[PDB]
Amino acid sequence: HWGYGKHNGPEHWHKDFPIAKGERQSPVDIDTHTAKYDPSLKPLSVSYDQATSLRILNNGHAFNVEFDDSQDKAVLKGGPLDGTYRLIQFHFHWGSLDGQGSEHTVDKKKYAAELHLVHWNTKYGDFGKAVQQPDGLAVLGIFLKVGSAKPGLQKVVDVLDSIKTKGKSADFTNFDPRGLLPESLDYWTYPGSLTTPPLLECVTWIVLKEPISVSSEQVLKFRKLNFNGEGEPEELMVDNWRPAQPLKNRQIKASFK
Template sequence: MQQWGYEKHNGPDTWHDLFPLANGNHQSPINIITQDATHDPSLQPLLVDYEPHSAKVISNNGHTVTVEFDDGDDSSVLRGGPLVGSYRLRQFHFHWGPSDGHGSEHKVDGVDYAAELHIVHWNSEKFSSFVDAAYAPDGLAVLAVFLKVGEPNRYIERITDTFDAIRSKGKESPFTNFDPSCLLPASMDFWTYPGSLTVPPLLESVIWTVLKEPISVSCEQLAKFRSLLFTNETAEIESCCMVTNHRPVQPLKNRNIRASFV
């Protein structure tokens, strides 16, 4: 049995038993109340500079599907927005829910989207490794993109086309020549706030940048995400599909949400 997961016996409601930070003061995701967000004119435009050849592998880690990148140098970085300096691209992954309309982690005025993409970066100017950065308040930067039900997304299709090879936990497949900026919306307006990883160990080391404009994904494409398995091929327990893998929103407490737009 997995130590943590998204089923009733090991889901988000139980994470605090193993990971006390689950009850911390800077937990993610959150519900973004737009009227309470403060426009901050000092926020810089977001600058993404990704090298397609740094993409390495796509895998099923038993919790989500992840695309990993070579982060040995600054060939793929995120700058601007709320960030000081550049943050190296490490990986991206997805969260989704049991129905096509509900599955994003963050909400906007109480409304969620069908799914959410997280593009994960780390502060290579201050830290020597991703692991070191993950334990520092300004160590990680995650760019979040909402997915809404609509037209099929040809860039998402490139990802779902690999799912037969990585259907079960622990499977991976080469995945190269992919620029994640193709998954970003036309508008780069965003909200930002200090938060945490949304999966254990829930470290409070993330500068979140949540893009306002969603991208599209079709019902058929979402169904492919839910067909992946939490379990591995040799699991003694019954195969279990990743029907949902998102954490509910957490209390904002005393944090401020800043907006790059009026």
């Protein structure tokens, strides 16, 4: 099926998913000199005090921390967004080495990894309906650089050995995603897509300028996960990122001057 291997990677996805060559594909390069400050944008509102984590899952292409989204408990509002978007999960993309891993780039710079906090527009009732809409999802993207350890990440790192292989899950309650945020919420925003099949063009992207720092040891443990299922030959889960896609007829806006 599709993946990030030698023969089923991003350059092949268009054969099953023709929207791969569409008009609003993600990720993109963020050219910092061309992004225009938009004084009409509002400050982001991140309300995660009531977030309730449930489970961590190895789904074969990343690991997901899933939240209880049966109520408005953890929501993203404001900035470019109209209405209320509810947190459903977060996951990461990372590299085989520190010089690559992110999906978005900044002046062509690649970070070691990229965190995505996925939210769905509650006016559409469920996420399945939301992904059929141009304003169905809001994904908050946060770059990871290697330096000092991120203490709020270690609980995630420590459970990864329990979900090594595709299809494994573990209980993962009481995790606070506010521990993964940088200091500043300054951001770039643009209309785009999911970065994995089915590549639906349903996302407002909000990509924070400030990266978080994680340690070498923390990211090394991401790279011990497996794409394969238990009992199959080991394929390390590394380089699960899609490269930058053409910007086409889109403008990237900055929240900051």
